[PDB]
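Major prion protein: structure, please.
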Amino acid sequence: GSVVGGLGGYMLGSAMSRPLIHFGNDYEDRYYRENMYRYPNQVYYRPVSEYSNQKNFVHDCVNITVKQHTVTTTTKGENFTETDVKIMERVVEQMCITQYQKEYEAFQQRGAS
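Here you go.
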């Protein structure tokens, strides 16, 4: 049916292990890795087979992934803090770079058969 609402052709990645980021902060690092269960463990992205560059994928991947999760709690459940949003963008970023390096070489077969 729907992925989340009306993505635009975007999909859902595999359920990965959430990478630790460093934020230059004693607090935010801890708040992240201690609360990390709260944050997403998959990312929402569009077909990289189209995309001419990983960078553009990473922006939309980050932006979109949070936008699903964020909209579908922030105005549909609980208003996430802007620090939650910011940390989440970063987790998603380091997830996205690995999702790409699978997706990219994946789709070239999975979407070509």
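Notes: The chain has three helices and two strands.
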